[PDB]
Amino acid sequence: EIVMTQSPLTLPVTPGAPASISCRSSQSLLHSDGYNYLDWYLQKPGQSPQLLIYLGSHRASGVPDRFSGSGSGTDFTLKISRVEAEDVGVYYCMQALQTPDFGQGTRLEIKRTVAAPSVFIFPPSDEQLKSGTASVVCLLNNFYPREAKVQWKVDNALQSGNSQESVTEQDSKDSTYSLSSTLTLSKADYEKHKVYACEVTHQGLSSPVTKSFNR
Amino acid sequence: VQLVQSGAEVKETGESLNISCKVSGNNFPSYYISWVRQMPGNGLEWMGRIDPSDSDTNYRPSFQGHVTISADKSTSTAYLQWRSLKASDTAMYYCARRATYYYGSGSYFDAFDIWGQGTMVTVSSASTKGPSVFPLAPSSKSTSGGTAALGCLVKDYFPEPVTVSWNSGALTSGVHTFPAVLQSSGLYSLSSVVTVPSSSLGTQTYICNVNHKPSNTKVDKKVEPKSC
Amino acid sequence: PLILRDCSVAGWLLGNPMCDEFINVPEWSYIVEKASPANDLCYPGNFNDYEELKHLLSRINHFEKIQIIPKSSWSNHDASSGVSSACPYLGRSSFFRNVVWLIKKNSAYPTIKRSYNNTNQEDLLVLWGIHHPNDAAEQTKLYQNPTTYISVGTSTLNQRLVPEIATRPKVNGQSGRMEFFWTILKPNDAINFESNGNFIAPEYAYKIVKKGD
Ligand SMILES: *[C@@H]1O[C@H](CO[C@@H]2O[C@@H](C)[C@@H](O)[C@@H](O)[C@@H]2O)[C@@H](O[C@@H]2O[C@H](CO)[C@@H](O)[C@H](O)[C@H]2NC(C)=O)[C@H](O)[C@H]1NC(C)=O
């Protein structure tokens, strides 16, 4: 094993600015043929890893020329000259001198400007009610930064331990996040109440935003 | 050249499993195919590799014994095989091609240049279950000349994963498909939304295409304003 | 234009060190040898499909040697000890300069798997060879493995050779023999080499253009 150490593990960068990821190996990767046997891969959210750089400094075909690799021996650097939204993902270096060992991976964070969520609430469908359960869904769309709070209220009673939420990774075009939160109730329960409300607090909002419907 | 991996699977602890990685083309020249594991949320781990032309095989010693690697020369397909799965085998498995060749005036290429799409393996006793798909209907009070949101709720399925497209691929802008959540029922639920101009709720058709291959469930659910 | 005085076409293409190299001329139009060249194969043997090659090379209009697989790329096989007093250079044991006589290293000859893709835009003439040693002691002395092969593939070639171990009458001191082969790689085709011994590997190859077209 050759221990591969990446720094930092999380790399926040201003959109359009340069970025640099360091990768160090516990032993030299320079081979007698003159090459450093070191690769960089990018794994975008939901995708397979893809080749960026091979043999230390060689850019693969179809990779934007904004990416380049340098270094020798035990010290290697991936440089992004201008960080674009579509570059979000996890970056891995990998030694190929021996049987491969990857580094831990570096998550690239794009520090776009604050953007308040667009909030939408959705009642359960009549189709799902026929089956015994009601899902109520609150959508927080295209916001930045990631930190958001959702509070559910049913006829102004706080709902607690109920909702499950999911968050997208930074959008490949505008680098915002979106969040989906689902409230679950039995059908009989759901039909006992009137006001279903989703309240959203976020740094882009001057004061919280509530979306509601009346059953 | 493409690496085509076999579909996602669920099996119980102690059962057998064999997953495949097919090299398209004539496989000339033949390169070593590596198997790489990614635990949920984790990084990448090299497991071993095989040259399908002669089945020369190298194993990472820490993986050897629990898993075997083999190949079929005629189809140029690599395999990762388990005799008795453990829960810690639940992971994504990628195959990758190590192209190694000289070119031009003595230049050299050595990389994992082509990757398969991944095979998700879930080790579990729960049984397979296709999803119920429900509409997330756009609000009637949408900003009459602004933006509306609609989506689909893909409810109660096992195992992962599901794919979701809109209008069979003709609608991509503004799509957000969320990570599934594991519910306390031991089933997954996932939502996929799209924002569109509200004026288009009276002119355009919106269909979410849900596919759940482990259960052979294909549901194209239209989503539209609900009538009063 | 190159007409050869001291050398066969085969000997010049392989880089027989006993032949004038014309280091100052990097390109040529065509090549034609003369009737009784003084130097042919310094290490004795046979050049396969030689008449077809000479016929092709008289019809060429441009010709340029390029390195395709650097000698320094061989890290677990010895790329410097494959020399012979049959191929002197300034008196010292040497060898054809455009190929590499790979030798075992640290008493091992691991299996070679090497590919070359002609990403140039001209046809590429590629040369290689196999060594047929005099006896079994020489087979293991040079290549460690007693039982060996050479496997060469392109889109149209599928050659597999086994060396013959046999004592021959001495030519330039050598009771072994070598057999040389060639093919033309079209642009974007690949060649694949596999061997666990007796392989005379390419280092240099030749871009060639045929008149017209
Ligand atoms: C031989 O190589 C050529 C060149 O491929 C490119 O060469 C290097 C720069 C390297 O970075 C490769 O990844 C490049 O793709 C191959 O021809 C290319 O093949 C790809 C197929 O995916 C195609 O997209 C390109 O258009 C091709 N380019 C040209 C000029 O034709 C060719 O496939 C290789 N031959 C074999 C047998 O593998």
Provide DSSP, B88-141: GG-EEEEEEEEEEEEETTTEEEEEEEEE---EEEEE-SS--BPPEEEEEPPPTT
Structure-determination technique: X-ray
Domain tally, chain C = 1
Residues B2 and B96 in one domain: yes
Query: Reduced to 3 states, what is the DSSP secondary structure of residue C142?
Result: helix
**Ligand 1: which atom is nearest the Cα of residue C187?**
1
- Closest Cα to atom 22 of ligand 1: B1
Residues A43 and A137 in one domain: no
Looking at the complex, does the CB of residue B51 fall below 8 Å from at least one CB of chain C?
yes
Give the domain range for residue B163. 126-228
* CATH number, position C180: 3.90.209.20
Find where tokens 């494959």 sit. C82
**Under 8 Å between Cβ of C21 and C90:** no
Contacts of A130 (CB under 8 A, 6+ apart): none
Residues B90 and B160 in one domain: no
Residue C17: asked if its preceding bond is cis (omega within 30°), the reply is: no
Residues A149 and A98 in one domain: no
Residues A175 and A199 in one domain: yes
Q: What is the distance between the alpha carbons of residues C67 and B105, in angstroms, rounded to a whole number? A: 5
**Under 8 Å between Cβ of B189 and B164:** no
Residues A158 and A170 in one domain: yes
Residue count (chain B): 228
Find where tokens 């091979």 sit. A54
Show which of B98, B125, B152 is a domain's final residue. B125
Q: What is the distance between the alpha carbons of residues B124 and B15, in angstroms, rounded to a whole number? A: 10
Residues B3 and B101 in one domain: yes
Give the domain range for residue C46. 1-213
Min Cα distance B133 → chain A (Å) is 9
Our CA angle for C101, C107, C113, nearest 5°, is 55
Q: What is the distance between the alpha carbons of residues C152 and A33, in angstroms, rounded to a whole number? A: 23
**Under 8 Å between Cβ of A177 and A171:** yes
Supply the DSSP string of A55-101, one letter for each residue. TTTEEPTTS-TTEEEEEETTEEEEEESS--GGG-EEEEEEE-SSS-E
Q: What is the distance between the alpha carbons of residues C17 and C15, in angstroms, rounded to a whole number? A: 6
Q: CB neighbours (10 Å) of residue A83?
A: 23
Q: Is C117 in the pocket of ligand 1 (CB under 6 A)?
A: yes
Looking at the complex, does the CB of residue B108 fall below 8 Å from at least one CB of chain C?
yes
Cβ–Cβ gap A178/B137 under 8 Å = no
Contacts of C107 (CB under 8 A, 6+ apart): C144
CB nearest B117 (choices: A48, A55, A184): A48
Residues A99 and A200 in one domain: no
Q: Nearest-CA neighbor of B114 among C106, A158, C86, A61?
A: A61
Residues A60 and A24 in one domain: yes
Min Cα distance C34 → chain B (Å) is 31
Q: Is C119 in the pocket of ligand 1 (CB under 6 A)?
A: yes
Tokens of B131: 């999803």
Residues A102 and A144 in one domain: no
Q: CB neighbours (10 Å) of residue C190?
A: 18
Domain tally, chain A = 2
Q: CB neighbours (10 Å) of residue C81?
A: 12
Supply the DSSP string of C53-79, one letter for each residue. HHHHHHSEEEEEEEESS-GGG-SSSBS
Q: CB neighbours (10 Å) of residue B113?
A: 19
* CATH number, position B186: 2.60.40.10
Q: Give every strand in the sheet of A209-214, ordered side by side.
A: A157-158, A148-154, A195-202, A209-214
Residues B115 and B144 in one domain: no
Residues B212 and B144 in one domain: yes
Give the domain range for residue A72. 1-111
Q: Is C39 in the pocket of ligand 1 (CB under 6 A)?
A: no
Amino acid at B23: V
DSSP letter for C61, please.
Answer: E
By DSSP bridging, strand C60-67 and strand C158-161 are unpaired
Residues A142 and A48 in one domain: no
Name the phi and psi angles at C204, rounded to 5: -110, 150
* CATH number, position A3: 2.60.40.10
**Under 8 Å between Cβ of C161 and C150:** yes
Residues A156 and A62 in one domain: no
Our CA angle for B179, B184, B190, nearest 5°, is 25
Residues A1 and A107 in one domain: yes
Show which of B80, B97, B125 is a domain's final residue. B125
Contacts of C199 (CB under 8 A, 6+ apart): C102, C112, C128, C129, C130, C131, C150, C193
C-alpha dihedral, C46 to C51 to C52 to C54, nearest 10°: 100
Query: Reduced to 3 states, what is the DSSP secondary structure of residue A69?
Result: strand
Domain tally, chain B = 2
Residue B161: asked if its preceding bond is cis (omega within 30°), the reply is: yes
C-alpha dihedral, A79 to A84 to A89 to A94, nearest 10°: -20
**Under 8 Å between Cβ of C64 and C103:** no
Which of C73, C100, C105 is most worth mutating to test chain A (most A CB atoms within 10 A of its CB)? C73
Residues B120 and B184 in one domain: no
Query: Reduced to 3 states, what is the DSSP secondary structure of residue A85?
Result: helix
Q: How many angstroms is it from B223 CA to the middle of ligand 1?
A: 44
Residues A104 and A128 in one domain: no
Q: Is C190 in the pocket of ligand 1 (CB under 6 A)?
A: yes
Residues B99 and B169 in one domain: no
Cβ–Cβ gap C69/B102 under 8 Å = yes
Which of C65, C72, C116 is most worth mutating to test chain B (most B CB atoms within 10 A of its CB)? C116
